[PDB]
Design an enzyme around this catalytic site. Structure first.
Site, PDB file in Angstrom:
ATOM      1  N   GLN A   1      -5.294 -21.868  -2.812  1.00 22.35           N
ATOM      2  CA  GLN A   1      -5.104 -20.553  -1.917  1.00 22.35           C
ATOM      3  C   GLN A   1      -3.958 -20.878  -1.094  1.00 22.35           C
ATOM      4  O   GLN A   1      -4.284 -20.308   0.020  1.00 22.35           O
ATOM      5  CB  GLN A   1      -6.671 -20.547  -1.316  1.00 22.35           C
ATOM      6  CG  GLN A   1      -7.417 -20.223  -2.324  1.00 22.35           C
ATOM      7  CD  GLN A   1      -8.926 -19.951  -1.901  1.00 22.35           C
ATOM      8  OE1 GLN A   1      -9.573 -20.814  -1.318  1.00 22.35           O
ATOM      9  NE2 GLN A   1      -9.365 -18.670  -1.908  1.00 22.35           N
TER      10      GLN A   1
ATOM     11  N   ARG B   1      -5.425 -14.671  -9.257  1.00 23.06           N
ATOM     12  CA  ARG B   1      -4.356 -14.449  -8.463  1.00 23.06           C
ATOM     13  C   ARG B   1      -3.053 -15.540  -8.990  1.00 23.06           C
ATOM     14  O   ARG B   1      -2.382 -16.254  -8.411  1.00 23.06           O
ATOM     15  CB  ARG B   1      -4.238 -14.653  -6.961  1.00 23.06           C
ATOM     16  CG  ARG B   1      -5.079 -13.666  -6.195  1.00 23.06           C
ATOM     17  CD  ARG B   1      -6.459 -14.119  -5.981  1.00 23.06           C
ATOM     18  NE  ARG B   1      -6.950 -12.851  -5.434  1.00 23.06           N
ATOM     19  CZ  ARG B   1      -7.074 -12.220  -4.223  1.00 23.06           C
ATOM     20  NH1 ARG B   1      -6.448 -13.062  -3.355  1.00 23.06           N
ATOM     21  NH2 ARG B   1      -7.735 -10.974  -3.960  1.00 23.06           N
TER      22      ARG B   1
ATOM     23  N   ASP C   1      -5.851  -0.212   1.604  1.00 21.23           N
ATOM     24  CA  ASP C   1      -7.031  -0.671   1.544  1.00 21.23           C
ATOM     25  C   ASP C   1      -8.318  -0.522   2.071  1.00 21.23           C
ATOM     26  O   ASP C   1      -8.168   0.561   3.064  1.00 21.23           O
ATOM     27  CB  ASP C   1      -6.396  -2.286   2.099  1.00 21.23           C
ATOM     28  CG  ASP C   1      -7.455  -3.441   1.650  1.00 21.23           C
ATOM     29  OD1 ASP C   1      -7.591  -3.691   0.810  1.00 21.23           O
ATOM     30  OD2 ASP C   1      -8.010  -3.989   2.750  1.00 21.23           O
TER      31      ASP C   1
ATOM     32  N   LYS D   1     -13.248   2.641   2.778  1.00 16.53           N
ATOM     33  CA  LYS D   1     -14.761   3.218   3.086  1.00 16.53           C
ATOM     34  C   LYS D   1     -15.064   2.583   4.117  1.00 16.53           C
ATOM     35  O   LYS D   1     -16.129   2.988   4.801  1.00 16.53           O
ATOM     36  CB  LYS D   1     -15.848   2.872   1.910  1.00 16.53           C
ATOM     37  CG  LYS D   1     -16.011   1.225   1.801  1.00 16.53           C
ATOM     38  CD  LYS D   1     -16.951   1.028   0.519  1.00 16.53           C
ATOM     39  CE  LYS D   1     -17.047  -0.540   0.202  1.00 16.53           C
ATOM     40  NZ  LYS D   1     -18.038  -0.810  -0.834  1.00 16.53           N
TER      41      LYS D   1
ATOM     42  N   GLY E   1     -18.421   1.949  -7.397  1.00 16.40           N
ATOM     43  CA  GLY E   1     -18.451   2.716  -8.693  1.00 16.40           C
ATOM     44  C   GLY E   1     -19.123   4.112  -8.842  1.00 16.40           C
ATOM     45  O   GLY E   1     -18.824   4.660  -9.994  1.00 16.40           O
TER      46      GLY E   1
ATOM     47  N   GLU F   1      -8.164   2.698  -1.805  1.00 19.66           N
ATOM     48  CA  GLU F   1      -9.172   1.650  -2.400  1.00 19.66           C
ATOM     49  C   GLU F   1     -10.540   2.026  -1.743  1.00 19.66           C
ATOM     50  O   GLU F   1     -10.951   1.593  -0.740  1.00 19.66           O
ATOM     51  CB  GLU F   1      -8.939   0.346  -2.073  1.00 19.66           C
ATOM     52  CG  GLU F   1      -9.897  -0.478  -2.908  1.00 19.66           C
ATOM     53  CD  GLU F   1     -10.420  -1.643  -2.005  1.00 19.66           C
ATOM     54  OE1 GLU F   1     -10.159  -1.962  -0.950  1.00 19.66           O
ATOM     55  OE2 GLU F   1     -10.757  -2.708  -2.426  1.00 19.66           O
TER      56      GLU F   1
END
Ligand SMILES: CCCCCCCCCCCCCCCC(=O)O
Ligand SMILES: CCCCCCCCCCCCCCCC(=O)O
Ligand SMILES: CC(=O)N[C@@H]1[C@@H](O)[C@H](O)[C@@H](CO)O[C@H]1O
Ligand SMILES: *[C@@H]1O[C@H](CO)[C@@H](O)[C@H](O)[C@H]1NC(C)=O
Ligand SMILES: OC[C@H]1O[C@H](O)[C@@H](O)[C@@H](O)[C@@H]1O
Ligand SMILES: OC[C@H]1O[C@H](O)[C@@H](O)[C@@H](O)[C@@H]1O
Ligand SMILES: [Ca+2]
Length: 476
Positions: A35, A344, A206, A209, A234, A230
């Site tokens: 990472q 990633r 990004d 919501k 669903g 974004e």
């Protein structure tokens, strides 16, 4: 570029840190579990634009560009760009301002668009929410700009989703109070200025919501370009209404049934068929959404199954559905990492082969889409129309009569049997000759109007009228 400009685009989404290094190495180590910054840069992207454009993409989406928290936290470095602290500096791991401008210019010289990922919801911080030193944030260098610290526990309490902090007390994500005029005005000035400085053609936003809806019309307006949000849900009843305040959203409604339909030979074609129609009618405009099956926030498609035929079908769907195709770097090399950080992987370690199976499939799917669009101004606004399904098949039709692409997809997988699908509803004239543009064969519409589609190897089939390909590079 405007929403209307973006309808015809096809996006290759990449992590700046993980796509291409300045030195062009294809062997430089990048262990996802570490990472850490692996060294990808904006200049590296420039030098691999031929690889990207060779698949028929017209645009890239890159991860956020702002300067990040500096620490190696317990969850690693900010290599992904979502832990910003200083919005008026760039992440110098990726290069300099001139490099980012150079990337934009190189895309524009090829007739391609730049889409940049932006976060408005939060900053990032190494450690517990109560430990935050707000002075490190630029320009929001005071706690007065932030919601009081709390974590989001109940994602059905929309006020808590918006007003509490993402993250935890290991890496905390200080939540801007986006109802404040000073905060809104600053973000609106910043985003307009970011777009101008780097000649950005579109934005991917990004964590939409997590910011109250009344923030977003002003933000989309100040950006001056197409914005795709974004909204990580669903349920089309939750996600599609965000298109009332933003040009588009990522098609998370289609994502879950699309993945399920093709991740195994027993996937449900019904759920996918029905979601296409639900989105078509309930979303403000399905043709401004972004279609995907793979990103950095979910297991990659091939983490579910290594079956290459299934992967070809799901990639064909992404490209030929309503809206903007979005393919995530590595998908075209059949990468199989699971959840973050495993999804990633560095694109360079593949060696960037332009002859892999999915590179070629994607190239063929984008080629026919790009070409059909050049010949049919109605293609991008014609609502994709599912015309057939059975237990292992879905067929769909898109484009002006006489110029429609008809796509037949299968989840039979690589061991699928050979047979002939008698397809009705394609809308071609009897006896007309069609080209199957993935495998480059021809089929003729029967007198009854049905298309006898040869099925084999679980392969996807994409049909287009042969006469319309005259003079194209498609299939000789
Ligand atoms: C008017 C916009 C839609 C809002 C409610 C739609 C409900 C769809 C399913 C909810 C998805 C996950 C939980 C969110 C519920 C909520 O809206 O608070
Ligand atoms: C924000 C403006 C639009 C608000 C409307 C949201 C719900 C309706 C969605 C648009 C209807 C488009 C579908 C008709 C085309 C078709 O089914 O072939
Ligand atoms: C165009 C622009 O705003 N540039 C920013 C400015 O606002 C401030 C300064 C400190 O950093 C730079
Ligand atoms: C835009 O460019 C100027 C330099 O011309 C710079 O000072 C400013 O911070 C930039 N703004 C953004 C949002 O990048
Ligand atoms: O306009 C916002 C302004 O706020 C502060 O002065 C600093 O963070 C500047 O970099 C920033 O541009
Ligand atoms: O709009 C720019 C301005 O925004 C806020 O008021 C503060 O962060 C300032 O430092 C700057
Ligand atoms: Ca928030």
């Amino acid at each position: 570029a405007t929403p209307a400009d973006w309808r015809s685009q096809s996006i290759y989404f990449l992590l700046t840190d993980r796509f291409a290094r300045t030195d062009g190495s294809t062997t430089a180590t990048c262990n996802t579990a570490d990472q850490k910054y692996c060294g990808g840069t904006w200049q590296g992207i420039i030098d691999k634009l031929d690889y990207i454009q060779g698949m028929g993409f017209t645009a890239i989406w890159i991860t956020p560009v702002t300067a990040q928290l500096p620490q190696t936290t317990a969850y690693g470095d900010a290599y992904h760009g979502y832990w910003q602290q200083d919005i008026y500096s760039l992440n110098e791991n990726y290069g300099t301002a001139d490099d980012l401008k150079a990337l934009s210019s190189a895309l524009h010289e090829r007739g391609m668009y730049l889409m940049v990922d932006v976060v408005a919801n939060h900053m990032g911080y190494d450690g517990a929410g109560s430990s935050v030193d707000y002075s490190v944030f630029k320009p929001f260098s005071s706690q007065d700009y932030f919601h009081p610290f709390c974590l989001i526990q109940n994602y059905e309490d929309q006020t808590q989703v918006e007003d509490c902090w993402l993250g935890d007390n290991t890496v905390s994500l200080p939540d801007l109070d986006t109802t404040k005029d000073v905060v809104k005005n600053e973000w609106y000035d910043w985003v307009g200025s970011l777009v101008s400085n780097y000649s950005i053609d579109g934005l991917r936003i990004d964590t939409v919501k997590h910011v109250q809806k009344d923030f977003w019309p002003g933000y989309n307006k100040a950006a001056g370009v197409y914005c795709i949000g974004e909204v990580l849900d669903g349920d089309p009843a939750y996600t599609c209404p965000y298109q009332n305040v933003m040009d588009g959203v990522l098609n998370y409604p289609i994502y879950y049934p699309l993945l399920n339909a093709f991740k195994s030979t027993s996937g449900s074609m019904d759920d996918l068929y029905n979601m296409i129609n639900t989105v078509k009618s309930d979303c403000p405009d399905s043709t401004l959404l972004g279609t995907f099956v793979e990103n950095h926030d979910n297991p990659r498609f091939a983490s579910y199954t290594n079956d290459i035929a299934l992967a070809k079908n799901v990639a064909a769907f992404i490209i030929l559905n309503d809206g903007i195709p979005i393919i995530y770097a590595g998908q075209e090399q059949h990468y199989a990492g699971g959840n973050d950080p495993a999804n990633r992987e560095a694109t360079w370690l593949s060696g960037y082969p332009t002859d892999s199976e999915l590179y070629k499939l994607i190239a063929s799917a984008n080629a026919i889409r790009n070409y059909a669009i050049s010949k049919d101004t109605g293609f991008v606004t014609y609502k994709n129309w599912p015309i057939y399904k059975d237990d292992t098949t879905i067929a769909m039709r898109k484009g002006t009569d006489g110029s429609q692409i008809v796509t037949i997809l299968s989840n039979k997988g690589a061991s699928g049997d050979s047979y002939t699908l008698s397809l009705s509803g394609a809308g071609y004239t009897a006896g007309q000759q069609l080209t199957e543009v993935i495998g480059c064969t021809t089929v003729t519409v029967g007198s009854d109007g049905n298309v006898p589609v040869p099925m084999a190897g679980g392969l996807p089939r994409v049909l287009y009228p042969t006469e319309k390909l005259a003079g194209s590079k498609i299939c000789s």
